[PDB]
Design an enzyme around this catalytic site. Sequence first.
Site, PDB file in Angstrom:
ATOM      1  N   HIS B  41     -13.417 -52.991 -26.164  1.00  0.00           N
ATOM      2  CA  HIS B  41     -13.696 -51.742 -26.284  1.00  0.00           C
ATOM      3  C   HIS B  41     -13.090 -50.772 -25.419  1.00  0.00           C
ATOM      4  CE1 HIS B  41     -17.437 -51.670 -23.560  1.00  0.00           C
ATOM      5  NE2 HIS B  41     -16.896 -50.651 -23.190  1.00  0.00           N
ATOM      6  N   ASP B  90     -16.592 -58.193 -28.195  1.00  0.00           N
ATOM      7  CA  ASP B  90     -16.088 -57.297 -27.113  1.00  0.00           C
ATOM      8  C   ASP B  90     -15.476 -57.792 -25.889  1.00  0.00           C
ATOM      9  OD1 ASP B  90     -15.601 -54.955 -25.887  1.00  0.00           O
ATOM     10  OD2 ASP B  90     -17.716 -54.427 -25.447  1.00  0.00           O
ATOM     11  N   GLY B 186     -18.238 -47.466 -17.047  1.00  0.00           N
ATOM     12  CA  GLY B 186     -17.579 -47.761 -15.979  1.00  0.00           C
ATOM     13  C   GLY B 186     -17.176 -49.075 -15.474  1.00  0.00           C
ATOM     14  N   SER B 188     -18.064 -51.624 -17.749  1.00  0.00           N
ATOM     15  CA  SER B 188     -17.401 -52.422 -18.816  1.00  0.00           C
ATOM     16  C   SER B 188     -16.170 -53.266 -18.691  1.00  0.00           C
ATOM     17  CB  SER B 188     -17.297 -51.713 -20.271  1.00  0.00           C
ATOM     18  OG  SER B 188     -18.472 -51.101 -20.679  1.00  0.00           O
ATOM     19  N   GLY B 189     -16.162 -54.413 -19.047  1.00  0.00           N
ATOM     20  CA  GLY B 189     -15.123 -55.364 -18.830  1.00  0.00           C
ATOM     21  C   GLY B 189     -15.089 -56.149 -17.660  1.00  0.00           C
TER      22      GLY B 189
END
Lengths: 58, 249
Positions: B41, B90, B186, B188-189
């Site tokens: 995303h 995701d 912030g 994410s990932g």
Amino acid sequence: LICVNENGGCEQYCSDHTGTKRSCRCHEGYSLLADGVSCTPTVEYPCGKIPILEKRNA
Amino acid sequence: IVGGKVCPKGECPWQVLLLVNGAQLCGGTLINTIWVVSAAHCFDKIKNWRNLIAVLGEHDLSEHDGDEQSRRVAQVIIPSTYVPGTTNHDIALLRLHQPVVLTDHVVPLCLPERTFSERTLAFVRFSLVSGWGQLLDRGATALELMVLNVPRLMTQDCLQQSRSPNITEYMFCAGYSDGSKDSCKGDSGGPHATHYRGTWYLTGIVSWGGCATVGHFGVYTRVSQYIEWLQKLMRSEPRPGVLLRAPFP
Ligand SMILES: CCCCC(=O)NCc1cccc(-n2ncc(-c3cc4cnccc4[nH]3)c2O)c1
Ligand SMILES: [Ca+2]
Ligand SMILES: [Cl-]
Ligand SMILES: [Cl-]
Ligand SMILES: [Cl-]
């Protein structure tokens, strides 16, 4: 021993074999000890280890 | 990260910072010297794919201490099954233009075998989530890398305890329902990292959905579902053009 239980006693990866057979394995940058379960690093910076902490207890 | 603490410098050495035009984009996880795992995303709104940068050995964003290593992102690989602006599947695999150099401050997280991950890791209660995300809902982002210990929930329990996207088999819940502790925008990932017998493994990716919302748990991409997909890709030759959509499974 079976892999689904207690990880087959393996420190890392486990494979079930035909019979009452089991094989443990180790990630790249590790080698399997003679106990057939334990993994020891073979490189300076193996995955999933924290150097400053490994040293902190060395 | 909400309700966590500063990750002491070097104690989160697999943590990646993703930048776009020098601006904070997302987190990531180093799994090898040239491979980084992130969230699909993160790339939804990417215009110029060529201005993507991955930073390793980062800690304090306010300063340069020389432990930092920056690399251009040569490839962003996303599963075919991922739909932009959604939550399912995701995940993203990033190929660096040049390998990072392993150091005390730069180390990959182990990508586990699926079986191991499913049979063992998945039952380790607590795992660590990290990033430079928002310290509070509707708050400012962190200057220092933050980390948080979160408990994992069986999906049935998650649903029960919760009170809107489904929780799919490609996801899992982790955290707290009391709005005190969570991963946030912030982050994410970033990694959801699980300890087993002296070694740390990649089990989750900080996905999305607000943050530290009462009655809700954090949602994470279930990395175990993707092991084989990732492994195959890592064995593959690079293709022209940054973005690559790859079939899943
Ligand atoms: C809808 C958004 C705007 C569209 C857009 O910009 N898309 C591209 C993009 C690129 C980079 C980051 C984000 N992004 N926005 C929100 C969150 C996020 C919320 C959240 C809660 N809990 C945990 C993690 C969480 N992450 C997030 O990661 C979106
Ligand atoms: Ca710095
Ligand atoms: Cl580079
Ligand atoms: Cl190929
Ligand atoms: Cl391109």
